Design a protein around this ligand. Structure first.
Ligand SMILES: *Cc1c(COP(=O)(O)O)cnc(C)c1O
Ligand SMILES: *Cc1c(COP(=O)(O)O)cnc(C)c1O
Ligand SMILES: [Cl-]
Ligand SMILES: [Cl-]
Lengths: 392, 392
């Protein structure tokens, strides 16, 4: 992960001289949050999950919305993300959503992170950091009832139960949450595992003399929070749906668009090869648009000869394999194309749209594999537009 | 591409609290440059190609070597890269290796870039920038003899020849180079296309009254420079081989390693699922190492259930699909594993090594697709080690 998340929001001139960039719809983000909120039970609260620099969309540009919306908790993965969240002025609960090294945890003490632990050694290490800093550190215990086999303690054996109790009774730590996480979007499996989580967490709280009313039980990602409402419990952990990436729930549109512009227009006669390995050959006299985007910007090699981009409201085929920095598009039958025109690589333009399913099939990746690396490799511009006195 | 390339080189403490990072062997980079140099004809010179933030390896950390080695020319793609090169103090020739938008070219005027043009409109636009800035701008003309169908002017038709002459005779520009680029590593095809390039460039120089001895003819990437030596001409453009990524020439080892550390060690009984979609189930009581690296750091989802990582000098299988931020490894039969130990995701550790071919097969990507995004998504640490008074 990036060591530092750049502090400045790109301005319009900076975007103008960028090769490619992300346009983030702040109004769509606001709307997705409000829509999500409308489905949450009275007794739950929201922890907005902002790992991978807010799913590529950018923590620094999005935090003012999180604050305005009064969201009480934010989740992150890296220390740089935790810093960006605190630097926005956010004074709510900040949780880490993964296991983190002792070095990570120690360097983050001033950020007031609630770490996520699933092993005795993590508890011992944090207890020592607590002792050395003259305080009690707040932690969440990850349980393995969901079957992720990832950050949690499995309690299906005597040894696992014993280890869980040791975690939960560690001197110098305050257990503020107990959680699990589900591996798929199968509502019936989630319900079965939720029941087991209730049993395990109840048992653990009894053994460790924890007080139920002081513990936040949380298990739900975006899918679960909306589609298994009885799993909302004390707190939900939506990430993807806020950003409009919950495949089961298309009523939350994606907030991200990936754009570039036409740099130059080149005339190539019939029977001309394009790109490394000469995988495409023109069948007619052609006009090709040269775009200064390639796989080092996160537009994969596999897009070549498969994907279309949008130029002047029309679909144009990407021809030849993508280069490291450049993509070539066939604009022979698109009229009105000129250098400098905006190109949509993912998103909408006039009446055309590139679907997520379209991106995934062409890239042979899942959508978050694309957008998380878009976000480390391109500047973000936060577009704010609607009608009167309204966000979207 | 990133809007700004971070100015500071990560220090040791910063790396210690990073989740994952790249280790760049500066001695190997130095050695690759010196070895490459030893094969260059007396009459050629080197333009080190540093696009995509030096192929993920980092312009800022590598420029002092380029300067010490007296390399006369550097190539870049983005304005941020051009800035990072000039900010190192480099006062040699700086060329752009792709078509760039008018907005990019205009904002870069103070960087003294020699742009790469293949269309009349680019020539007209640059001539106007030259006029407005009260100078003559230096340019390279890209010709399409190599058949990339990308940044160049195709001259196989009367219209293409006429356009090439218009580019080459544009008032207020100084043509300092004429170039092409080859689409594959087929030495016989390269030789045939080289002959055609000589014919085309000779013809163009005659028509535009250019003086041969004032023009740098350049056609060779890494492969071509080493394997078709008659194509070295006046200047070569090696990128990949300097960084140790020339598949045909394994005698230039890769300079990059991708690392993380063991965050936590988890006991999971037989018949336990791991990861989203539960694609792996333990067949025995297991100990799993939780690593804080995932696909948002550039370690792809496809690595899961395929790849191995190196821990304590031993290969360990990645189990379950990679998460956005976390990877799980089976260390049941690896002794000596402890939290905090270094993990090699790509590179060497003791007597073990992960091959490039291994990475490509598992990721289903070509190597530069991996490392360019590693470099936008992780800090770089420049390791300097050898024996006495020597770089490597
Ligand atoms: C990322 C993640 C979330 C958010 O998941 P979505 O499916 O994007 O809503 C919540 N909790 C944990 C532990 C996660 O890793
Ligand atoms: C990137 C590129 C190079 C360097 O290519 P390698 O195969 O990495 O040596 C040289 N010239 C141009 C025009 C390029 O695009
Ligand atoms: Cl988990
Ligand atoms: Cl080219």
């Amino acid at each position: 992960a990036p060591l530092h998340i750049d502090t400045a929001l790109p301005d319009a001139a900076q975007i103008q001289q960028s090769n490619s960039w992300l346009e983030i719809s702040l109004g769509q983000f606001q709307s997705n949050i409000e829509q999500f909120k409308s489905h949450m039970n009275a007794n739950t609260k929201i922890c907005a999950i902002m790992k991978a620099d807010a799913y590529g969309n950018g923590i620094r540009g999005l935090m003012p919305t999180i604050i305005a919306q009064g969201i009480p908790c934010v989740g992150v993965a890296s220390n740089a993300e935790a810093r960006a969240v605190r630097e926005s002025g956010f004074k709510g609960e900040l949780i880490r959503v993964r296991s983190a090294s002792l070095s990570e945890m120690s360097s983050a003490l001033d950020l007031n992170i609630e770490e996520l632990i699933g092993t005795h050694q993590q508890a011992l290490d944090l207890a020592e950091l607590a002792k050395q800093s003259g305080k009690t550190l707040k932690v969440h215990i990850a349980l393995n009832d969901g079957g992720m086999g990832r950050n949690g303690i499995d309690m299906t054996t005597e040894a696992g139960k014993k280890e869980a109790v040791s975690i939960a009774t560690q001197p110098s730590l305050s257990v503020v949450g107990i959680m699990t996480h589900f591996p798929n979007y199968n509502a019936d499996e989630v319900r079965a595992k939720l029941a087991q989580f209730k049993e395990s967490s109840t048992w653990l709280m009894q053994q460790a003399n924890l007080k139920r009313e002081e513990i936040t039980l949380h298990v739900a990602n975006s899918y679960t929070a909306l589609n298994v409402p009885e799993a909302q419990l004390d707190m939900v952990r939506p990430g993807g749906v806020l950003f409009g990436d919950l495949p089961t729930n298309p009523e939350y549109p994606s907030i991200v668009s990936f754009k570039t512009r036409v740099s130059s227009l080149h005339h190539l006669p019939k029977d001309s090869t394009v790109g490394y390995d000469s995988t495409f050959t023109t069948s007619r006299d052609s006009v090709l648009a040269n775009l200064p985007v390639g796989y080092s910007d996160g537009y994969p090699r596999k897009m070549g000869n498969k994907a279309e981009v949008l130029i002047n409201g029309q679909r144009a085929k990407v021809v030849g394999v993508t280069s490291m920095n450049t993509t070539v598009v066939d604009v022979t039958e698109i009229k009105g194309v000129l250098p400098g025109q905006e190109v949509v690589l993912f998103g909408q333009q006039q009446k055309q749209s590139i679907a997520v399913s379209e991106m995934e099939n062409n890239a042979e990746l899942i959508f978050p594999e694309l957008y998380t690396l878009w976000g480390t490799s391109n500047p973000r511009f936060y577009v704010k537009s609607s009608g009167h006195h309204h966000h979207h």
